[PDB]
Write a protein that binds this ligand. Structure first.
Ligand SMILES: CC(=O)N[C@@H]1[C@@H](OP(=O)(O)OP(=O)(O)OC[C@H]2O[C@@H](n3ccc(=O)[nH]c3=O)[C@H](O)[C@@H]2O)O[C@H](CO)[C@@H](O)[C@@H]1O
Length: 196
């Protein structure tokens, strides 16, 4: 089902299979960790002993970018299509925004996460974004944020802290968090807020 690229499992999925897998994940009552690796993450994975351990315990590693698909041309069944990890995030919010699935946005510089919430509520109307918080907090604050994420009954956590911080922060709190999908989506808040 998956492809071993220099230690990093990449699931052989299309945009639509990846959106379908993620929809079935919301139906299973456990934390799923989704990551979107590109060639640059796989190179990071070689120097970072811990990051590699993490990329092998995620529930879904979705191939981000055209470069990593190119590398797959060495394998027997190469990766089927160009998936952009940002497109995956947006096509995903399109589908759940009618069904009222609660989304929390943790990350980005001060007031950036709040602006991305606004533009999403327009593009995908009726989307339930239950909370946000900037990506610069303390160990004291972390407990407060996680408490909010859990108590507001968020099913989807979009962590925008960049690689590999986002994938590492999720894995540490993989037992504290009570959401169904926690997906590192680094820097896509900056894009949606129009800052970048
Ligand atoms: C799609 C994806 O996985 N992209 C990654 C990329 O993301 P990026 O383009 O955003 O690059 P950064 O320079 O790391 O950006 C930092 C972002 O995280 C926020 N942040 C950071 C630190 C913090 O303590 N709190 C925060 O909130 C900040 O506001 C901003 O949104 O980074 C890697 C290296 O470049 C890439 O290899 C990798 O593909």
């Amino acid at each position: 089902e998956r492809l071993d690229i220099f230690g990093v499992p990449i699931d052989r999925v299309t945009m639509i299979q990846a959106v379908d897998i993620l929809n079935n994940f919301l139906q299973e009552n456990r934390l799923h960790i989704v990551a979107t690796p590109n060639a640059e993450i796989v190179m990071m994975a070689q120097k970072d002993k811990e990051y590699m351990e993490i990329l092998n315990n995620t529930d879904l590693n979705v191939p981000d970018g055209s470069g990593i698909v190119f590398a797959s041309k060495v394998f027997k069944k190469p990766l089927p299509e160009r998936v952009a990890g940002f497109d995956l995030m947006l096509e995903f919010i399109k589908g759940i925004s009618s069904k009222g699935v609660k989304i929390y946005l943790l990350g980005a510089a001060a007031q950036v996460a709040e602006q991305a919430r606004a533009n999403l509520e327009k593009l995908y109307p009726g989307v339930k974004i239950v909370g946000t918080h900037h990506g610069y907090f303390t160990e004291e604050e972390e407990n407060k944020i996680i408490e909010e994420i859990n108590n507001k009954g968020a099913e989807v956590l979009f962590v925008a802290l960049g690689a590999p911080k986002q994938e590492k922060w999720i894995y540490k709190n993989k037992d504290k968090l009570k959401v169904k999908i926690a997906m590192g989506v680094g820097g896509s808040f900056d894009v949606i807020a129009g800052k970048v």
